[PDB]
Design a protein around this nucleic acid. Sequence first.
RNA 1: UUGGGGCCCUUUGUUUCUUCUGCCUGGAGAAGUUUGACACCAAAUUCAAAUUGGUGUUAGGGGAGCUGGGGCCUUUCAAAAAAAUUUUGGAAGGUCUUGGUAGGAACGGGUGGAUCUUAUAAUUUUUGAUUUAU
RNA 2: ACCUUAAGAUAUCAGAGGAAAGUCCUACUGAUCAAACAUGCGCUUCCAAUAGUAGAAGGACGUUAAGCAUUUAUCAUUGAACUGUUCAUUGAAGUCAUUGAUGCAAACUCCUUGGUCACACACACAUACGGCGCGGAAGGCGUG
Lengths: 169, 123, 75, 178, 107, 71, 91, 16, 119
Amino acid sequence: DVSRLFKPRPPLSYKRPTDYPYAKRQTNPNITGVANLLSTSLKHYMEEFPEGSPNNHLQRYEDIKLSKIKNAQLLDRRLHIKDTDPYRTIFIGRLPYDLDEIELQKYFVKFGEIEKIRIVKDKITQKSKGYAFIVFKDPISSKMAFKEIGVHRGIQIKDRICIVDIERG
Amino acid sequence: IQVAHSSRLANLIDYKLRVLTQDGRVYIGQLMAFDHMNLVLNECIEERVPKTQLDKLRPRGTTLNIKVEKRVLGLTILRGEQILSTVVEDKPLLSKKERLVRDKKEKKQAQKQTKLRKEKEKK
Amino acid sequence: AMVPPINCIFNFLQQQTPVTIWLFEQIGIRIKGKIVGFDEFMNVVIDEAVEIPVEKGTPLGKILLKGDNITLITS
Amino acid sequence: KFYCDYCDTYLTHDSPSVRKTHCSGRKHKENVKDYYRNKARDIINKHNHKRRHIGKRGRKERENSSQNETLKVTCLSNKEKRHIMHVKKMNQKELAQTSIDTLKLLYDGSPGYSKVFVDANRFDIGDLVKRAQTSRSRDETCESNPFPRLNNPKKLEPPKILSQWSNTIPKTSIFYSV
Amino acid sequence: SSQIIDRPKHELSRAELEELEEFEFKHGPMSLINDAMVTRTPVIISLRNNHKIIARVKAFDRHCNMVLENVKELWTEKKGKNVINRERFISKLFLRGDSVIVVLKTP
Amino acid sequence: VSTPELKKYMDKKILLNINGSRKVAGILRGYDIFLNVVLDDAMEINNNHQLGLQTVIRGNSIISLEALDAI
Amino acid sequence: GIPVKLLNEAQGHIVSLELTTGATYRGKLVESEDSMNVQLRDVIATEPQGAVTHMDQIFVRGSQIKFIVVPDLLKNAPLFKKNSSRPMPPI
Amino acid sequence: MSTPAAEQRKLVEQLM
Amino acid sequence: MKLVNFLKKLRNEQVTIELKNGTTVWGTLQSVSPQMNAILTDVKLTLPQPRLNKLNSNGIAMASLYLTGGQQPTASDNIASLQYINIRGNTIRQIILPDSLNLDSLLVDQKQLNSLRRS
RNA sequence: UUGGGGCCCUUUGUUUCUUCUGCCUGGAGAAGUUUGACACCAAAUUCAAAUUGGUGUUAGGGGAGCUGGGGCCUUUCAAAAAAAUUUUGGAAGGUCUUGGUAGGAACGGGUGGAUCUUAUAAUUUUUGAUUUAU
RNA sequence: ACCUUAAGAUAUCAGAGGAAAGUCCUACUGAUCAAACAUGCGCUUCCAAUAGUAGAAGGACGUUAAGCAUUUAUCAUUGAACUGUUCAUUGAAGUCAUUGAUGCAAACUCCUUGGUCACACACACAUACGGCGCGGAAGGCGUG
């Protein structure tokens, strides 16, 4: 009963092949040359289609390429906050967009004396771009306040998270 | 026979296909698996037109009658390199509702047997 | 011991033993010469290649024989 | 990741001898034997019959079949039919496994016996037999046992008869054999 | 340079892969077909089955299968001395890349 | 990927049919994963002329590789 | 793939396979690999024109095989069933 | 590791 | 850029696939596998007669066309009307697209455009 | 409950959901229905039982509730062309039908399998040596 | 004793919001696609005598059957006669068949398959034919 169940079928009958032998199998040989067409038929083809149809799907490709080559040089094209050196002056970042200069001055005065404050806003609209420059009366106090406001999950911005660091100027 | 328009080779499982090869030989058997697209046919019988009767198919009694030599061969796996094109010929023995019924049956039985197997193999 | 065919072709290259390459049929030609270098895919460059139909063929110079046609490489 | 579908053991991904080691052991050699015994046992046990289309019999067809007679139906009890089915299945198995080898025993002392009937020194399938019985060697010559009849052999086994028809046999033999 | 070009295709990164594809299409043998599409000059493609097509390429691919329009299939069927010249015009055509042999650009 | 199982044919005479017509007999020496084979002391069976002391056969054109020995 | 695994399950049983050259071969199947290379034993060959011979072994490259005929009983193989249960492979 | 060509590279490269 | 992706965008349009044998399949085109395994549905296979008296035709193509099982016994030319022939990818030689469709909207490879924007 | 007529019993292991009792002058009786039961296969201890490992079977019809969907009708509400008319949307009720009735939701991972992309157009399947050719 | 792994992703575009340039996400929102499940179309094709001993579809790896008509059965060397032909000898291979193969055609026998359903034994129809009984099979299309 080991192999009494896997009894194979009877041997397959023989039929004379209807295809070509493995030795005679080939694709088309004697493929004629391409030079003869160029002399005669090419002239007729060029005469009967003067101009080809426009290549339109490349328009979108080159158009988006134009965006890439158009964004960069235009951002590079360019050239209240011109205070003293930032050794004693403090800087803030990521402040609220709808914030003001007096509120920023008060927030900076919460942890250090302020001598000169002037917030630089975007030129497009009169809204605080989130940058406030505060001159401090003590560089050590300003550095300590910046460290505290950076380690304490960011200073309290009105509608954002305002991390603080050096002015880096 | 009519076959659904959105029916890939996965839907035609146990349909009785008509597989054609490069050398003018056809295979007529039930599809049961695939992959490179090399099928497995259950009872496929291979047909061919002999060279002696090939001349009757050429353009010109009114109705042609071709005697095709056929061989019987069972549970054969083809190779996708030779396959040329496949056609469908007949529907399976079971209707669609009965097919769904037996699938649900086997799924229930398999889930129960798997649960019992886990219960035995853990304890 | 076992020598791979790549090692055999390397030995042919090193000892400069002349080889007669059998291009497969329906082309009906053979190439005789010395192997200067081989590749991954049995692509071989041949120096002093001699064309022989299947012996009145013409020398070809230095050729690069694509490996998809080679059938034997015998010395 | 490939697992055996008979052993159901999940096997760490292999492709070399690791699959030739699993498939050549014993937990995958006899556990693949029990599987196909059951599947082939089913197709022997299947009793489902073709769908029955019953047509309305007509009057000309009914009157003649109603004229003749009614026929009694033989019927058995549950235990009796259980026993009969068991006996019939056993008889079918026993007859199906039976192989007749009278010609192998008849030529036991032939001059070229060891080269044909031994089946281990044959020239066609001997290549398979050639860790794991007083086998008959090929080097036997006809000089051994010059006279076979010197009490060495035994009488031919009497022919078998069907047991369900064992009363059919003639009661007494023609001649008195001791 | 040489190392990345000779470098086997299974160890380069994704970005360098499509960079390699773009470089192959721009500076390579398929630059011919790319130029032929861009300046819209006809190409004469010689197929494997003795068919010559004259057409303008609109999109090609790695395997050298292209979409063509204004195709004009030219081929001859012969037996012994007799020869007949047949031509067929196809408006828009897709062409598989395993058949082509030599692709000639119009002068 | 997976080396073909020819570790039992080593140094045994085999006869393999090149393409569909040619038949070459020799002593196998090695093999590759493409089923390239290097066989020494070849002889093109057809009278039959020997090929050379060391030949390699591209595995594309091999069809069958039956062995004329005990195996 | 399923057919390769089926040919793997068909080991040790007499299979008949026809090459692309036209020849036919049948005999015990010793070993098969994932690329359809097979090794037949005690094979009875039929060359294309009809002649029949016999060899001890043969190793035919899988790129030339047209089809392979396994015993009919393998239709009940466990790997042909679609809905299957897995033992939740370990970590 | 993909097609056998990579494996043959990791043999031929060492051979040269 | 893979033209199989463009070919997948037709999906319901009448094509004329010319295989490598010579037989030309005409019929509505359903989905195309990423290997170009076309699946046409309302097909009308036909075999071009070479129009030359002594050059007869392909023979294996006639055998395959008849063994498909749809050849009309009274048909003068070799045509076989059937439904749902699945064509293996490697057998197609060239696909004659319809004349009416627009190429500018279908040839834009969305994946390549996405890659270019991402880069 | 009893009798009569018709048709069926190949239901062939005489209803085939299982066991047990049982049947042709009859179509019947008891117990049971999924972490369970029942049938069968294989072995070795040197018959049987024992166990371990396997393959299956657990159904068909009708009804009540409960519930998914459609068609048609009524009422009520909102918008436009208004408390009279219509169309559109929603709620409730009626009628008819059609389907379901033991699992379902959420979360989760060093979970299986399908499909897709890339290695991959370089000898073993799909990026061409089977239109028989010069 | 041999074995311990290709890597990624899971509808798509467009619009609003959140973490200069992308980048991600939204039990967010439109449009397209695909799948499942319900549910419909006067949608399209198909579903076997009993008022009778039938028939339809597909087979036969069935018989008549050695049917009726054609056509096939090696190569080399040497000797002999002979005007290429016949007889013998050595060597080499050589699927079985000749009751075969191939061409043509017919009768017969038998297997599987099916609603062998219900109401009818009926005078119809030009816009050519109430497609206005219940189911089943297979597709096409639409809605939720």
